Amino acid sequence: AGVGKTVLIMELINNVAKAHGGYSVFAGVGERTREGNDLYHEMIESGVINLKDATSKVALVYGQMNEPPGARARVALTGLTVAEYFRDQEGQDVLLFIDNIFRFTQAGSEVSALLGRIPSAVGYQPTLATDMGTMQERITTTKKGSITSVQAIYVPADDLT
Amino acid sequence: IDMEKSQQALVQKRHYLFDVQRNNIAMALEVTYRERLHRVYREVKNRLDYHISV
Amino acid sequence: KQVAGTMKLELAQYREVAAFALDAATQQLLSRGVRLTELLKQGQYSPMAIEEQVAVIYAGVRGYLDKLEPSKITKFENAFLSHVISQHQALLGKIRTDGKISEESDAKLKEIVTNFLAGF
Amino acid sequence: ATLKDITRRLKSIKNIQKITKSMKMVAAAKYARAERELKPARVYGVGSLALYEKADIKTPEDKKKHLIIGVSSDRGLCGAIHSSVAKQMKSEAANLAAAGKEVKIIGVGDKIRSILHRTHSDQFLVTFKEVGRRPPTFGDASVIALELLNSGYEFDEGSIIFNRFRSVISYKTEEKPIFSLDTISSAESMSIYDDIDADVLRNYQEYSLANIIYYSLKESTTSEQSARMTAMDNASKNASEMIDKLTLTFNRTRQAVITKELIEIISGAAAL
Amino acid sequence: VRSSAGAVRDAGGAFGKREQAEEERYFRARAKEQLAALKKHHENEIS
Amino acid sequence: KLALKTIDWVAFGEIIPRNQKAVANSLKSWNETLTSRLATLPEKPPAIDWAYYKANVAKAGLVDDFEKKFNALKVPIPEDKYTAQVDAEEKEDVKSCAEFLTQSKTRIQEYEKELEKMRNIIPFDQMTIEDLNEVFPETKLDKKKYPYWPHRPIET
Numbered sequence: 145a146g147v148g149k150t151v152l153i154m155e156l157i158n159n160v161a162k163a164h165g166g167y168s169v170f171a172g173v174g175e176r177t178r179e180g181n182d183l184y185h186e187m188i189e190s191g192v193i194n195l196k197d198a199t200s201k202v203a204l205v206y207g208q209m210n211e212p213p214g215a216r217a218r219v220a221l222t223g224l225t226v227a228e229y230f231r232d233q234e235g236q237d238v239l240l241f242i243d244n245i246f247r248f249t250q251a252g253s254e255v256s257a258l259l260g261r262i263p264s265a266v267g268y269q270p271t272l273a274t275d276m277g278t279m280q281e282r283i284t285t286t287k288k289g290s291i292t293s294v295q296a297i298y299v300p301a302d303d304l305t
Numbered sequence: 306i307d308m309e310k311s312q313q314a315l316v317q318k319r320h321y322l323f324d325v326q327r328n329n330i331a332m333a334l335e336v337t338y339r340e341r342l343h344r345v346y347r348e349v350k351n352r353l354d355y356h357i358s359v
Numbered sequence: 360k361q362v363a364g365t366m367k368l369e370l371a372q373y374r375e376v377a378a379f380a381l382d383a384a385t386q387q388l389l390s391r392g393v394r395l396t397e398l399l400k401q402g403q404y405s406p407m408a409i410e411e412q413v414a415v416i417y418a419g420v421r422g423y424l425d426k427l428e429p430s431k432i433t434k435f436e437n438a439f440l441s442h443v444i445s446q447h448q449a450l451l452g453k454i455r456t457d458g459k460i461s462e463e464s465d466a467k468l469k470e471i472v473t474n475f476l477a478g479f
Numbered sequence: 480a481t482l483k484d485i486t487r488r489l490k491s492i493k494n495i496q497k498i499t500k501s502m503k504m505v506a507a508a509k510y511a512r513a514e515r516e517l518k519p520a521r522v523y524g525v526g527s528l529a530l531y532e533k534a535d536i537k538t539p540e541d542k543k544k545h546l547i548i549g550v551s552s553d554r555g556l557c558g559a560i561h562s563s564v565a566k567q568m569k570s571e572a573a574n575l576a577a578a579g580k581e582v583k584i585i586g587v588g589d590k591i592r593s594i595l596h597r598t599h600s601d602q603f604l605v606t607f608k609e610v611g612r613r614p615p616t617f618g619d620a621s622v623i624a625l626e627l628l629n630s631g632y633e634f635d636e637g638s639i640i641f642n643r644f645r646s647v648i649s650y651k652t653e654e655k656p657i658f659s660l661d662t663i664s665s666a667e668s669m670s671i672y673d674d675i676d677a678d679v680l681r682n683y684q685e686y687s688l689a690n691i692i693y694y695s696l697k698e699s700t701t702s703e704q705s706a707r708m709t710a711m712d713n714a715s716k717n718a719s720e721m722i723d724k725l726t727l728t729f730n731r732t733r734q735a736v737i738t739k740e741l742i743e744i745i746s747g748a749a750a751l
Numbered sequence: 752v753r754s755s756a757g758a759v760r761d762a763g764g765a766f767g768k769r770e771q772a773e774e775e776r777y778f779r780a781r782a783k784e785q786l787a788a789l790k791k792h793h794e795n796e797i798s
Numbered sequence: 799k800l801a802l803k804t805i806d807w808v809a810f811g812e813i814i815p816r817n818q819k820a821v822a823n824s825l826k827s828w829n830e831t832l833t834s835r836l837a838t839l840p841e842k843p844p845a846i847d848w849a850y851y852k853a854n855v856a857k858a859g860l861v862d863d864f865e866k867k868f869n870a871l872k873v874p875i876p877e878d879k880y881t882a883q884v885d886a887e888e889k890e891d892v893k894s895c896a897e898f899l900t901q902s903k904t905r906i907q908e909y910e911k912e913l914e915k916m917r918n919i920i921p922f923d924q925m926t927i928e929d930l931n932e933v934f935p936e937t938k939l940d941k942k943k944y945p946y947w948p949h950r951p952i953e954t
Contacts, residue, residue, distance in 0.1 A: 262748045266740065303483075306909050309902055316894045316902075321810045322822070323887050328802045329829050330883075332836055334876045335800060339839045341873045346843045349868060356855055376779065378772035385779055441834045446804075478807020486752070491762040493754035729752065 149296040150179060153243055154186075156294055161192060161202065166237030167230045168192070168202045171223025174216040174247025177208040203230075209247070216251035224282055231289030238291045240283060246298035249276060361460055362416045369420065370395055387425065394424040397432040407440075410454040414443055417460070418472045426476070439475055447471060482732050489725045496718035502556075503711035509614075510647070510704040516614060517644065517701045524694025527687055528655070534668040536658055542635035543581045546604070546627075546657065547572055548692070549595075550641040550699045551588035552611030557703050558710045560642055563652045565594035567640050571654065572599060583632055587623060587696070604632050615700055620693030628685060635659055641695035642702040648709065650702035655691060660684045 161168045172180050184204070187193040192202045203226050207219025220242060227240040249272060256269030264270045283293045373392025376385055398419040401407075407415075415436055418424065424432060443451065450467050454460065460468065480488075549568045551561045568584065568591075575582045584599055586592040586606035595603075605626055610619075637657025642650045660681050663669055760767045814822040852861045878884075919925075919933060930937045939949035 257747065260751055262751070263744055267743065267747075306906065306913070309906050309909070313899065313902055315812060316898060318809060319813050319890060319894045320887075321805060322813060322825075323883070323890065324803060325805060325810065325825065325829060326883055327881070328805070329825070329832060330878075330881050332800070332802060333832050336832060336836050336839065338873075338875050339836075339843075342843045343839065345873060346846075349864065350846070353851060353855070353861060353864065356857070356861070357851070375775045376772050378768040379776065381776075382780060382783070384783060385776060438830055438834075441837050445833075445837055474806075474808070478810070487758070487762040488764060489752065490754040490758040491764060491766060494756075494758050495766065497754070726752070 145298065149298075150175075150243060153241055153294060153296050154183070157187075157241060158190075160292075161239055162190065164201075164237070164239060166239070167234065168239040168241075169205070169223055169227045169230065170202060170241045170243075171205045171207070171220055171226075172243055173207050173220045173223075173245060174209045174211075174251060175243050177206075177210060180204075180206050180208055207247075213251040213254040216247050217255070220245065220248045220279060224279065227291055227293075228282060231286070231291050235289060238289065240291050240293045241295075242293070243296040244298045245295045246300075248279065362413055362420060366395055366416055366420050390425050390429075391420075391422070393429045394427070394432060395419055397429050398424070398436060400433065408451070408455070410451045411440060411444070413454060413460070414451070414468065415439065417468055421469075421472070423472050423476055435476075435479065438479060439472075442475060443471065482729075482736050485725065485729045485732055489722065489729055492718055492722050492725060496715055496722060499711050499715040499718060503708055503715060506704055506708040506711055510701070510708055513614060513697075513701040513704050514644075517697050520694065520697040524690060524697070527690035527694065530687075531656070531658065534666070534672070536662060536666050536668065538636045538656065538658065538662055539665070542661075543579065544633065544635035545575050545580045545582045546585070546632070546634040546637040547575075547582055548585045548587065548627075548637070548639040548657075548695075549591045550639065550692075550695045551586070551591040552700070552703050553589040553608055554611040554703070554707070555590065556707055556710055558706045560650075560699075560703050560706050561588070561590035561594060564640050564642060565591055567652050567654070568595065569599065571638060571640070572602070583634070585623070585627065587692075605630055610696075611700065611703065615693070615696035617689070617693050620689050620696055623692050624685065624689040627688065633659070635661060639691060639695050641699045642706075643698050644702040644705065647705050650705065653698075655695070657688065657691060658684070 157168075157170070170183070172183075184193070187202055187204075188195065192200065193204075194200045205219055205223040205226060207216050207222075209216070211219075223240065223242065227238050230236065230238045249268070252272070252275050253267065253269050256271070257263065261270050264272065269275070283291055285291055369388075369391055372388060373395070376389065377392065380389070398415060418435075418439060419432075424435065427435060447467075450464065450471070453464055457464070547568055549564050551564050555561075572582045572584065582602060583604040584595065584602045585604055586595065588610045589606075589608045592603070592606045592608075607623060607626075636659070639655045639657060641653055641655075643653045644650050660677065663680055663684065664677055669675070760770060811822070848861075848865050852858050852865070855861045916933075920929070927937075941949060944950065
């Protein structure tokens, strides 16, 4: 926390997304709502989000950290679905920014104990790897389209292990 | 000559030490007077607060 | 915003070379860092008006306190506050109302600090 | 602390111990070389001092100009080498000034300058650095003597303080007097020496100054290398004791963490 | 349990800060010297 | 009530003889502490809510008596007896304006006299040894102590 994940991802949106022909998607998963509003207004100012015409180049999905775990565990899938559609039917390049994709895991962990599952190594659900794989495996560049996925991943207490 | 001229220049403003002393004495008397005022005020309000608390 | 920025840079540089205690440049860098450090101390339940904080930090960061010892900086801070709060209430009101250190305000601040430093 | 704090501390101390062992080995090699080079310089310097102790020269008791030279190095981590020398220098300078003299100081090595830069900061005639990087040569002593003579502080009496190397584990701090030709000319023991005007004697004094400085350099470097070897050995030993204690603590903490996580899992499993 | 390179400054204990300062002071000195030389070269190359 | 004459301090510190700085610094500090105290005290003693208060007490007569006694009774005020140092001011006028001024001005007068005397002298290429003897009494060769030629101690 406090190292530059959000600033770096905003910088990437500033560079790549602004000068990118294809569409773009931003799924804010379990992050501060202040930042969601700041991004909305910064995008409106830059022009990627146009409130007047139909020339907007970014679709936003928000599941911020005031939501109950059920919504945080699924907003990533909602943003991923929007990106998947733009990949397949539109048959075009897509960007997909997620911030953070650790809140998906964490939100999955906040309900596992109440669903009757014994916990795993460190208070995590037994299905951590499978639950994360069944999501990260739809964010891919198939032969029908191409998703460039940038993910911010919180590392609790700087512990990379 | 210039040394003497500078000494004379300082003669003019010699009086500031007395000026400081006067300011100090006057404002010290003023401080004591204000302390007396506030002390009577505080004691009387505590005095009467006794009765209301009772 | 004007003053705390330079103060932030000065403390950031000071914290790097602090673990020890030669040349004039780095010796003065440590001196300024220490002066600012003892400037930031404070008591309990005595918060300061923003303009007063600006005055103190401006005095400290503009090389004025670099002459004083670092054990006397608290004495300065306190006496300077007491002096300004009465003699120069007008300048503090100006800084609060206009919300910036204008050129005339800066020149005043300069002369007040220069006079007070010697007179102490 | 927590397990990560202990792990980081343990790794740091292990690195420190490795480094101190390597430095002890390097210092030991340099010490062996320094002793080897010190034997001949020992005979040479003792010979150069021969005259004054054979023709007993008493310094005049009516002169105020004195010179203090203190030989050390730039390198640290040598224990109480620079400390002893600086302590004795300030002792002697205080005594001289209490006797009403006009003392100066030459510092051969930074650490001497630093130790004496708070007090005696104004008596520094000149100081020399870059000592200790390579073994001292006669070139260094010639340069020091040349810059002492060139800098026109004609002194009336002198002293040099260096750490005489006794043994691989011990050293002593000495004070070898230095005389100016004013004292050699007017010494009755010197009336026996033949073919001696006041010019050959001046060249002789300049050479003897170079000789004594070189002797002190060799003794000081030998003692300093010995002290650095000893200091590094002791530091490595202390790091080893600290590593043992921290390894015990780390093992306790690792087991405690395993037990804590396992009990959390068990409680969660049984609390369904 | 092993040790790795660059661990003294990873712990951040006393030795870490001591090393950081021992580096920073030296390189501030060298930067000052190099800046002086750069100014001298600037002046000497105007003509 | 309060209007304190302003001071210059760097100016003030120029007028303390070394034998008198030990009292000057103490006076400065005492001024500092007293000024801080005065700043501490408020501009006025706060008011009193007699109506509400006497409405919140049973023996309203007793509180009324206290209120009236408060109104009638006032507080004293010190005097300038401790300001006897008034006298000192006049004494200073003597040194500053009568004594020191006068002898200083006379010494000036003499220094001028000497200066214009030393500035109006013939070019040295036209002067004579008697002239040096008179302009500079330092070039005189005292015959009272060196009657014989050269009247100098030749070792010179």
